[PDB]
Amino acid sequence: AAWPKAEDPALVQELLDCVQQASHYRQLKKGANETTKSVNRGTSELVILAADTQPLSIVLHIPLICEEKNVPYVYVPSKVALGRACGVSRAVIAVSLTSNEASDLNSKIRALRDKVERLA
């Protein structure tokens, strides 16, 4: 069910790096429930999930509402890599990252979901 699977040749790495930079700019909603709140409230600019979920059904619900809100989603293959990409000390299973009016981070979100649009 991971048909937007991100490729380990550095697209995963740019995803997790932009996760970390958004974590340092506090633009980051972590975990599946808070990701779901950000997508349902429409604050979300991009959303990554983790395909290393042991039952992946517990994150399969957010591609629905991301298709409804028309925000790009993409899966990285490790919730541990996403977890310390956030800086959490636990495994983050699905992360959402928003934006503001003016930031270089918002530019990096723009180019990043341009690459996600090249996937989907």
Partner: protein, 347 residues
């Protein structure tokens, strides 16, 4: 002294105790220390070959005072490393702090609070109590432990720092957390010599552990199973070897422990695969072959010994596994405890 040791005859020992969480190790030849997330810094004892268990410990206190340098901590320590003489013990952690004090009765006298996130790595200079303390505010500070005074801060870390190794000269090899960069400190002239990786079946997300074999080259371990030697002479890697602890759609398991023998060619690298993995530097001193495989749980930290006498035949080395990883509990396993697998290499 790689092939002058017999890996196939290793005499191991699996000691465990109650706290279940153990994080690091500190040798004081021979006296071994540990640090457990229950809050313990244990002085335990091993010496005689032809077995001893432990003597004493200290507790991290939930003590609501402010700028207090006494015996009270605030929170559990993370890593510990002990002096070459045997006259100072120092630790630091997510109580945002160090303490340094007498190693015999183990009563904390100085709590250094100059760092401001968490003290995530610690090393010495050999033969001198010049201390290097590297911390989660992505900095590395250097201490004059002769006065227990503060010396200098250093900067250049792109990301939250992760580990330091240092030797008898005023120099360091640090690692940043995710930035794929080992960072070679010229301490007196406060310069730095940046060695970045970018291994190119995962690519290098983070770069976990570091070890200096000598004053000319070193080795770093990344979380994609890439183990890399680096010459100080050259910006490129001296060697990169891939999938250092097997796979687990599967992914290479990352290196969680690396420590080498100084002025030697013996590389000690472990993971959550359960098997310790000893490497050697090759005869060309440029490449790397397999001196081989040699328990349960996910190995956080690892130590060193030697026979050290006129003979110098047969090492001793403990792995200090634990159930989780060392700073955060991103991965949990039922296997391992607060343990110590002392395996001794004969000949």
């Amino acid at each position: 002294l790689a092939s002058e040791l017999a890996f196939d005859k290793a005499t191991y020992t699996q000691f465990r105790w109650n706290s279940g969480t153990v994080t690091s190790v500190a040798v004081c030849p021979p006296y071994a220390y540990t640090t457990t997330k229950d809050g313990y810094l244990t002085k335990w004892k091993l010496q005689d070959l032809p077995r001893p268990e432990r003597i004493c410990f200290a507790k991290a206190d939930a003590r609501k005072a402010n700028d207090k340098t006494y015996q009270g901590h605030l929170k559990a320590p993370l890593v510990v490393k002990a002096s070459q003489d045997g006259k100072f013990v120092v630790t630091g952690g997510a109580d945002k702090r160090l303490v340094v004090y007498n190693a015999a009765d183990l009563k904390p006298i100085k709590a250094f609070t100059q760092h401001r996130d968490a003290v995530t790595g610690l090393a010495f200079r050999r033969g001198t109590n010049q201390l290097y303390s590297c911390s989660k505010d992505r900095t590395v500070k250097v201490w004059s432990l002769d006065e227990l005074a503060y010396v200098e801060t250093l900067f250049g870390h792109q990301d939250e720092i992760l580990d330091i190794d240092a030797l008898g000269q005023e120099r360091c090899v640090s690692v940043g957390a995710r930035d794929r960069t080992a960072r070679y400190w010229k301490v007196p002239e406060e310069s730095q010599l940046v060695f970045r990786g970018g291994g190119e079946a995962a690519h290098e997300g983070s770069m976990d552990r570091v070890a200096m074999i000598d004053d000319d080259m070193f080795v770093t371990g990344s979380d994609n199973g890439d183990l890399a030697l680096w010459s100080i002479q050259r910006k490129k890697p001296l060697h990169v070897i891939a999938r250092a602890h097997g796979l687990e759609a599967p992914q290479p398991r990352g290196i969680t422990a690396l420590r080498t023998l100084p002025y030697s060619d013996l590389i000690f690298s472990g993971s959550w695969d359960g098997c310790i993995r000893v490497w050697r530097l090759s005869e060309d001193k440029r490449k790397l072959e397999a001196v081989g495989i040699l328990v349960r749980g996910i190995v956080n930290d690892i130590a060193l010994f030697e026979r050290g006498e006129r003979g110098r035949d047969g090492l001793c080395v403990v792995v200090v596994t634990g159930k989780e990883m060392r700073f955060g509990r991103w991965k949990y396993m039922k296997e391992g405890r607060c343990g110590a697998v002392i395996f001794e290499v004969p000949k």
